Amino acid sequence: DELNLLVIVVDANPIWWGKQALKESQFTLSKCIDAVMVLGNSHLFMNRSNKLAVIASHIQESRFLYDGKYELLTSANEVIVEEIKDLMTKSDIKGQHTETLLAGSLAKALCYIHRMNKEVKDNQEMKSRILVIKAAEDSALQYMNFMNVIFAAQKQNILIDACVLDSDSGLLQQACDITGGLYLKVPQMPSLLQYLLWVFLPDQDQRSQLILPPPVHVDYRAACFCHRNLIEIGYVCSVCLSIFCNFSPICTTCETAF
Amino acid sequence: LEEKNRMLQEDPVLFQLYKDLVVSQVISAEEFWANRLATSQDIINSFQSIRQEMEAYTPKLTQVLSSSAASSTITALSPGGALMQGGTQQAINQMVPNDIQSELKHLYVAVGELLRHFWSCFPVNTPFLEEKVVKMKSNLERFQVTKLCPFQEKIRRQYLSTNLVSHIEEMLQTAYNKLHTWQSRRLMKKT
Amino acid sequence: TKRWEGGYERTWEILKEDESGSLKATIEDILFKAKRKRVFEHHGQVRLGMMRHLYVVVDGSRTMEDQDLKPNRLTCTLKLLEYFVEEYFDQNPISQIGIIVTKSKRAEKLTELSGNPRKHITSLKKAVDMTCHGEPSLYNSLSIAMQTLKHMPGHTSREVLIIFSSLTTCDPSNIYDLIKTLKAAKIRVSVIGLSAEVRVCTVLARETGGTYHVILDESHYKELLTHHVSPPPASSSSECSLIRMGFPQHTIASLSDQDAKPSFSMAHLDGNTEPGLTLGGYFCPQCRAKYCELPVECKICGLTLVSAPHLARSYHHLFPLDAFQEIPLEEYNGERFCYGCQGELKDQHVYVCAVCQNVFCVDCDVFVHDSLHCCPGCIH
Amino acid sequence: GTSSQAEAARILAASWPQNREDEEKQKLKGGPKKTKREKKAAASHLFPFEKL
Amino acid sequence: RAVIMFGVPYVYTQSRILKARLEYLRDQFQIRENDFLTFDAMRHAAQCVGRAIRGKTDYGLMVFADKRFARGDKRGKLPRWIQEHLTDANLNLTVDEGVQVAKYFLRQMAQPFHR
Amino acid sequence: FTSDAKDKPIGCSVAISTYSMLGHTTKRSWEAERVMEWLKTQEWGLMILDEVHTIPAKMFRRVLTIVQAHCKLGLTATLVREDDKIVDLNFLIGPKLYEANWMELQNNGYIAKVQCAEVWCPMSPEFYREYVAIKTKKRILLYTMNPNKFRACQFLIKFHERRNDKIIVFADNVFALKEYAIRLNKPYIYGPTSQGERMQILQNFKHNPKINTIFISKVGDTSFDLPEANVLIQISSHGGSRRQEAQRLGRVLRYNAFFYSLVSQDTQEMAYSTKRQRFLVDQGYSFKVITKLAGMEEEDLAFSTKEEQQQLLQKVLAATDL
Ligand SMILES: [Zn+2]
Ligand SMILES: [Zn+2]
Ligand SMILES: [Zn+2]
Ligand SMILES: [Zn+2]
Ligand SMILES: [Zn+2]
């Protein structure tokens, strides 16, 4: 009667993966996709009722990615491979946008989890969690939307786990701390699959049994309204609670509201 | 005199603070009670390169992981590893014994009081407060030389692994930097 | 005449059949009628707020020994006060609570006016075992509250809450002059009595603009406190109200790094108990002081330390999500897959956003309007 | 007396519906509960004096 | 808010003024002396106790501190607008139960009402 | 018109009276005779009957024939009755118009959701021998005064007083109720006491924190003005009176509340409780069975030792009503 749903958000930003490929390093996007597929197969093998979802984030949008081995896994892997090929090959850079649409992917994941929860029979509880692997730099323009997504996830009691590869993201740290998830930065990229299977594979009930690395130093720097930049000291309106970097005689937000 | 003495008698912690500030010539008794009262087309080239690379993509099984990588990751994730550092001031409750701890608390209280006075003086909007901030900085320097340097010597002699001095220096260094920046800005306004 | 003396209602007349089996389809509409039972608003009331400096006055006379509320008035009052403090700090990010206790014709400031929730609860728990003696003095408590709140900035809403158990008060001077002074000082005073209505409390509440209520039982007491939880409405733009506050990052210390400096918390240094010597905590952005609780105003530099998510949690009220246009499935010429949940659109009605023109099913529309508060299509 | 108290307690508290229920409990699960949902339902369906 | 009657107020029988009126009523109007005395006492009590209710919004408490008021011949002399509110439950109750009744009445009357 | 004040019923719009007064077969009072003569000389509009379930009686049936009215409206809470005389009520007054659904009524929150309990107690060895020894109607006191049931009742009283809940203890066979109530030194209503004492006891039961438990002996088996209570404990009621148990349950609702029924195992009281709860299970209530009381031995209760238990036999057999 225990159902676990795992949604894996893959940072498929073409710029960062192209730079990684040009670096000629031992880790590429192909290995990341293979590790994600292996993690999904392991999650499906953990229990029959386990449900898997994979969402790939791109500059354009979010794509729902979902002989001798399991039949369902063979079908599942082929669909994911076809989707990732279709997304990347047909991805054409049209504009100067470079930040990853991480907030939209999380919103789609929340909508999918909400859809799946209703279809579950009332006798069983669907424990759901979201795992995010971060490759590109964080986007400060989507701060409010990201916070709204975090609050929505916390309201429905959905764990959010972040697997940072290259650069730490404050938004992911806040999401992990607020929702009670696990935040981890990968020291060695080629060993990504072992980290995923050792840390993020167990469910919340099993995480109590096991011993896990302590949470990293989570920051809580706020985003200014007129700059959308993280700040430590700033001016905050007492009515609308808006945050400003510099003092102003009149609040812009309160002036907007009539 | 009699009234002042009874106040210190009621609070021995304040009396020890009074001795550490007035007797040691750090501050005068007059000032003591005064406060008390992106890139070029290379990005497009990389995008095209990754698109071409992922056009011909095939899943792999052996290439995903190796025995050495898994062993190294487990060693890192084993207790006492890099990510699983289990010490984290293992016996800090028993280390740096309570005799040092009481002195550390007294130093923390003194630094907090002095910095509270300094930041209450800040910002300096009147010429009167200009001298008060200089006197506060002089008192801070005198207290540091009188207490922290012997404290640093005691720590070095006992070889404590905790960097108790470092945090106190950070606050004092930040205060000094803020004062220097404000003085520079004041000089800028006069240019 | 009367409404029920006319014709008897036949509610079963709604269902109809035309093909000897169409009834199922009708109940399907009923299922579609089952959903959308909310107004798409979790609160639906005040869409803004204003900072409050609330003072809670607690009677400490012999009347608190009465056993109207088990076990006595004082214990239930303090329990509900702890609940009120928790809820009030939950629903007000930058508000402050002070506590005054009136006893033996005198007023004692039990806790200073601050925003720390843990300190007030501990003070109340300590005060649970106090000794009830003498008679209350509303004049002294009101004078202390006015003296403290006189210097507060005008944009802040100054509120005083009095929990008056005893029916008699001793006034060293005329109280109506104090009431006029409070009215001139723009202080809102609300009283929640326990025994019966008192003329002076009613006059004070009426003149100062507050509300006076009398407890019927413990449930009514909790309801009155919950009503007092909600912040008062504020004007669209009143003054130049801005406050300098910092945002401390929760930096923990690990022995793996060389920057792990143990430090005693400034708040914990003021307690009688041994201060916590923890690895790390919240560092002040101005003077690098260490604190363990938020939101706590810094004792050294006077800066206020506030957690950004607490402030951001109320931003959806500033930008409410516009209702999506309900469109029947037949009249929509496009993709039949939901943009949010990727599910097939089979319901009779499909909701389309007015900005991104994406299609959302009933479940996704309800989820967006209730919890997400942001359109996923508009995010991209 | 003290012995009479114990004898009366033994006679009363375990007369009919304990000589088998206690034996079944001795031969029962023993380990932890099945799920947390079962414990919540049991607490909801138990009387206030049976939860103390 | 509360009007207390400490005993039935009986006019003094001295001065040989009340007794002359009693005799005149007895031999002329056939009025019982005891009945007239009870009538006068209850009339004064009701007159001095009914002034606590002036206006629809006004409310008040009325207590009689004498067991003699519990007798029917004296309750019947109260005005009709007070009889129906004087339930038979509280006619001889002790001090503590009277205090409890007063507390309950005041607590339930402190709530707002409508027009 | 109940022969108490006689507030001039002649020339009135609304008249309120009671049964057993309109159907007297004996000599009547002079004033009452004239009142009845006046009343039997005009039409009545919407003659309202309360507790209609006990209409089919020897003298209550003729009441409808002794007055003339156009509409006869009957109101009750427990329409179940023995002697299958409810069928007669179909033509005595009219058809059953409305039957409220109690489950949906309590789902809306306007009726307290009472958690029914049927907790039984084993028969003590000093009592079961006498219970099986005698059969000529003398066994009622034996299972009525079961020491184990007494201990269970005392424990429930103490628990619900510690949690501050109003308690009403129904107990027929007032001979047993005497020693049942004086043992705990608590107020009780014998029934043939007086009118003022019962009224004042019920009036001070509600608004008094010191006393929050009362005992009723078959007096509360009708529609009275009993105040709101959360705990009801019934011991040794009538045999199969579904009406009585339903009425007793109705005195609680107005889990906000819960009521307990104590019975003695291996006795006729078990069968009586089983056969009297069928009306409530038809209404939708479920009677959970409680076999063990948590913390029974935690505190001291009466009849702790066997000495007083065996002493109880003499005083319970001391009836000898022969
Ligand atoms: Zn700004
Ligand atoms: Zn504003
Ligand atoms: Zn600071
Ligand atoms: Zn959908
Ligand atoms: Zn949209």
Curated annotation (Swiss-Prot), chain A:
Gene3D superfamilies (alphabetical): von Willebrand factor, type A domain
Family per record: Belongs to the TFB4 family.
GO cellular component entries: core TFIIH complex portion of holo TFIIH complex; nucleoplasm; nucleus; transcription factor TFIID complex; transcription factor TFIIH core complex; transcription factor TFIIH holo complex; transcription preinitiation complex
Record PANTHER family: GENERAL TRANSCRIPTION FACTOR IIH SUBUNIT 3, TRANSCRIPTION INITIATION FACTOR IIH TFIIH , POLYPEPTIDE 3-RELATED
Full protein name: General transcription factor IIH subunit 3
Zn finger limits (C4-type): 237-254
Job description of the protein: Component of the general transcription and DNA repair factor IIH (TFIIH) core complex, which is involved in general and transcription-coupled nucleotide excision repair (NER) of damaged DNA and, when complexed to CAK, in RNA transcription by RNA polymerase II. In NER, TFIIH acts by opening DNA around the lesion to allow the excision of the damaged oligonucleotide and its replacement by a new DNA fragment. In transcription, TFIIH has an essential role in transcription initiation.
GO biological process: DNA repair; nucleotide-excision repair; regulation of DNA-templated transcription; transcription by RNA polymerase II
GO MF term (any one): zinc ion binding
DNA damage found in the keyword field: yes
Entry keyword set: DNA damage, DNA repair, Metal-binding, Nucleus, Transcription, Transcription regulation, Zinc, Zinc-finger
The UniProt record lists the keyword Zinc: yes
Cellular location(s): Nucleus
Swiss-Prot record, chain C:
Pfam families (alphabetical): C1_4, Ssl1
UniProt keyword annotation of Endoplasmic reticulum present: no
Coiled-coil segments: none
Record-linked InterPro entries: C1-like_sf, Ssl1-like, TFIIH_C1-like_dom, TFIIH_SSL1/p44, VWF_A, vWFA_dom_sf, Znf_C2H2_type, Znf_RING/FYVE/PHD
Keyword Ribonucleoprotein belongs to the record: no
A GO biological process held by the record: response to UV
Zinc fingers (C4-type), renumbered ranges: 284-301
Tissue expression summary: Widely expressed, with higher expression in skeletal muscle.
Cited Gene3D superfamilies: von Willebrand factor, type A domain, Zinc/RING finger domain, C3HC4 (zinc finger)
GO annotations of cellular component type: core TFIIH complex portion of holo TFIIH complex; nuclear speck; nucleoplasm; nucleus; transcription factor TFIID complex; transcription factor TFIIH core complex; transcription factor TFIIH holo complex
Keywords: DNA damage, DNA repair, Host-virus interaction, Metal-binding, Nucleus, Phosphoprotein, Transcription, Transcription regulation, Zinc, Zinc-finger
Mutation effect (residue 301 to A): Reconstituted TFIIH complex lacks p62 and has no transcriptional activity
Residues the record lists as Phosphotyrosine modifications: 88
GO molecular function, one term: RNA polymerase II general transcription initiation factor activity
SUPFAM superfamilies recorded: Cysteine-rich domain (SSF57889), vWA-like (SSF53300)
Cellular localisation: Nucleus
Domain VWFA: 53-229
Tree of life domain: Eukaryota
Family, as annotated: Belongs to the GTF2H2 family.
Protein name: General transcription factor IIH subunit 2
Curated annotation (Swiss-Prot), chain E:
Effect after changing residue 43 to H: In TTD1 and XP-D; able to open damaged DNA and incise damaged DNA
Compartment annotation: Nucleus; Cytoplasm, Cytoskeleton, Spindle
UniProt modification remark: ISGylated.
Variant or mutagenesis effect after changing residue 107 to W: In TTD1; no longer interacts with GTF2H2/p44; has 5'-3' helicase activity
Record's signal peptide: none
Outcome of mutating residue 1 to W: In XP-D and COFS2
Effect of residue 1 to P: In XP-D and TTD1
Sequence motif Nuclear localization signal, location on chain: 67-80
UniProt family annotation: Belongs to the helicase family. RAD3/XPD subfamily.
Domain notes: Interacts with GTF2H2/p44 via the C-terminus of this protein; mutations in the C-terminal region of XPD do not alter its helicase activity, but prevent its interaction with and helicase stimulation by GTF2H2/p44.
Disease: Xeroderma pigmentosum complementation group D: An autosomal recessive pigmentary skin disorder characterized by solar hypersensitivity of the skin, high predisposition for developing cancers on areas exposed to sunlight and, in some cases, neurological abnormalities. The skin develops marked freckling and other pigmentation abnormalities. Some XP-D patients present features of Cockayne syndrome, including cachectic dwarfism, pigmentary retinopathy, ataxia, decreased nerve conduction velocities.
Protein name: General transcription and DNA repair factor IIH helicase subunit XPD
Species of provenance: Homo sapiens
Gene this protein is translated from: ERCC2
From Swiss-Prot, chain F:
Post-translational modification, as annotated: Dephosphorylation reactivates the 5'-excision step. Phosphorylation has no effect on transcription or the 3'-5' helicase activity.
Motif stretch (DEVH box): 50-53
Residues bearing PTM Phosphoserine: 286
Residue positions binding ATP: 251, 254
Residue ranges constituting the Helicase C-terminal domain according to the UniProt record: 151-302
Cell compartment(s), UniProt: Nucleus
Family stated for the protein in its record: Belongs to the helicase family. RAD25/XPB subfamily.
Subunit-structure text: Component of the 7-subunit TFIIH core complex composed of XPB/ERCC3, XPD/ERCC2, GTF2H1, GTF2H2, GTF2H3, GTF2H4 and GTF2H5, which is active in NER. The core complex associates with the 3-subunit CDK-activating kinase (CAK) module composed of CCNH/cyclin H, CDK7 and MNAT1 to form the 10-subunit holoenzyme (holo-TFIIH) active in transcription. Interacts with PUF60. Interacts with ATF7IP. Interacts with KAT2A; leading to KAT2A recruitment to promoters and acetylation of histones. (Microbial infection) Interacts with Epstein-Barr virus EBNA2.
Protein name, per record: General transcription and DNA repair factor IIH helicase/translocase subunit XPB
The organism of origin for this protein: Homo sapiens (Human)
Gene that this polypeptide is encoded by: ERCC3
Residue numbers of the full-length protein present here: 392 to 722 of 782
